[PDB]
């Protein structure tokens, strides 16, 4: 599970969590805090335990790699700039809503190509009509 | 959270899980499998996560230390022998039922003194009347 952002032929990859910088995750924390304060949106925490009993580690079901890529793009690309995100998996439903809200809240188009579909987000809505 | 078993002035302590022997936990596995097959009893798995997100470890809410002590006593003490268990905590409800079923299924008295009460198990019932 990984995600790339394309900025005029510049590609950066994001997975998982070894931070490229700490200012990305603080940008991401302020963006997510914006979503809950502005529109009252909270994502759902999903995880697995391969065995519940006695000291197993928590494994998250969705890496949310594109969220980090979006935060990166809001830092390095100028305003109104289209964020171009690529994913090798199917975008999860919470991240799809995340992209919609960001595209409207921050007034930026987002062209996401996931494992099977091009998602063009603009002004809060997507080209796929929320069917993918 | 620990538990002691007293065998004629011989005291063994059990916590957590570094096994004294592997034959104790295989005795315990066969005893618990007896409880589900004979009387259809399954315990409830309770645990905590201090933070759900991203790789935290699972911490169990009840160590069930006396269960290991009981299995130990069924190995080293002869039949009909009273198992004397001490706990520094309050015996949990599932372990209290565990002690009741064992005292009837294996025909042994169990004198458990927990953090505040003497529990005398015999023939499936306890001296506390399931109020502790
Ligand atoms: Zn996601
Ligand atoms: Zn879409
Ligand atoms: Zn217990
Ligand atoms: Zn009792």
Short mmCIF file of N, CA and C in Angstrom, two decimals, chain A residues 16-17 45 47 49 52-60, chain B residues 16-17 45 47 49 52-60:
data_model
loop_
_atom_site.label_atom_id
_atom_site.label_comp_id
_atom_site.label_asym_id
_atom_site.label_seq_id
_atom_site.Cartn_x
_atom_site.Cartn_y
_atom_site.Cartn_z
N UNK A 16 3.07 3.48 4.44
CA UNK A 16 2.93 3.34 5.90
C UNK A 16 2.11 4.46 6.53
N UNK A 17 6.07 4.06 9.75
CA UNK A 17 5.85 5.38 9.17
C UNK A 17 7.06 6.29 9.38
N UNK A 45 -11.82 4.33 12.49
CA UNK A 45 -10.62 3.54 12.74
C UNK A 45 -10.94 2.07 12.53
N UNK A 47 -9.02 -1.80 12.07
CA UNK A 47 -7.78 -2.50 12.32
C UNK A 47 -8.07 -3.99 12.45
N UNK A 49 -6.51 -7.76 14.38
CA UNK A 49 -5.63 -8.48 15.29
C UNK A 49 -5.60 -9.92 14.82
N UNK A 52 -6.11 -12.06 19.17
CA UNK A 52 -6.39 -11.05 20.18
C UNK A 52 -5.58 -11.32 21.44
N UNK A 53 -5.41 -12.59 21.79
CA UNK A 53 -4.90 -12.94 23.11
C UNK A 53 -3.44 -12.58 23.27
N UNK A 54 -3.14 -11.79 24.31
CA UNK A 54 -1.83 -11.76 24.96
C UNK A 54 -0.74 -11.16 24.06
N UNK A 55 -0.81 -9.83 23.92
CA UNK A 55 0.33 -9.06 23.46
C UNK A 55 0.53 -8.92 21.97
N UNK A 56 -0.47 -9.21 21.15
CA UNK A 56 -0.31 -9.05 19.72
C UNK A 56 -0.33 -7.57 19.35
N UNK A 57 0.26 -7.26 18.21
CA UNK A 57 0.31 -5.89 17.72
C UNK A 57 -0.93 -5.57 16.88
N UNK A 58 -1.22 -4.28 16.79
CA UNK A 58 -2.36 -3.80 16.01
C UNK A 58 -1.92 -3.53 14.59
N UNK A 59 -2.68 -4.05 13.63
CA UNK A 59 -2.43 -3.83 12.21
C UNK A 59 -3.61 -3.07 11.64
N UNK A 60 -3.35 -1.89 11.06
CA UNK A 60 -4.42 -1.08 10.50
C UNK A 60 -4.85 -1.62 9.14
N UNK B 16 1.62 -13.47 34.82
CA UNK B 16 1.55 -13.32 33.36
C UNK B 16 0.65 -14.36 32.70
N UNK B 17 4.76 -14.36 29.64
CA UNK B 17 4.38 -15.65 30.20
C UNK B 17 5.50 -16.67 30.04
N UNK B 45 -12.95 -12.87 26.18
CA UNK B 45 -11.67 -12.20 25.98
C UNK B 45 -11.85 -10.70 26.18
N UNK B 47 -9.58 -7.05 26.72
CA UNK B 47 -8.26 -6.47 26.52
C UNK B 47 -8.39 -4.96 26.38
N UNK B 49 -6.40 -1.37 24.52
CA UNK B 49 -5.41 -0.74 23.66
C UNK B 49 -5.26 0.69 24.13
N UNK B 52 -5.38 2.87 19.77
CA UNK B 52 -5.72 1.89 18.74
C UNK B 52 -4.84 2.07 17.51
N UNK B 53 -4.53 3.32 17.17
CA UNK B 53 -3.94 3.62 15.87
C UNK B 53 -2.51 3.11 15.77
N UNK B 54 -2.25 2.30 14.75
CA UNK B 54 -0.93 2.14 14.15
C UNK B 54 0.06 1.43 15.09
N UNK B 55 -0.14 0.11 15.22
CA UNK B 55 0.90 -0.77 15.73
C UNK B 55 1.02 -0.93 17.23
N UNK B 56 0.02 -0.53 18.00
CA UNK B 56 0.11 -0.70 19.44
C UNK B 56 -0.07 -2.17 19.80
N UNK B 57 0.44 -2.54 20.97
CA UNK B 57 0.33 -3.91 21.46
C UNK B 57 -0.96 -4.10 22.25
N UNK B 58 -1.39 -5.36 22.33
CA UNK B 58 -2.60 -5.72 23.05
C UNK B 58 -2.24 -6.03 24.50
N UNK B 59 -2.98 -5.44 25.42
CA UNK B 59 -2.81 -5.68 26.85
C UNK B 59 -4.09 -6.32 27.37
N UNK B 60 -3.97 -7.51 27.95
CA UNK B 60 -5.13 -8.21 28.48
C UNK B 60 -5.56 -7.63 29.82
#
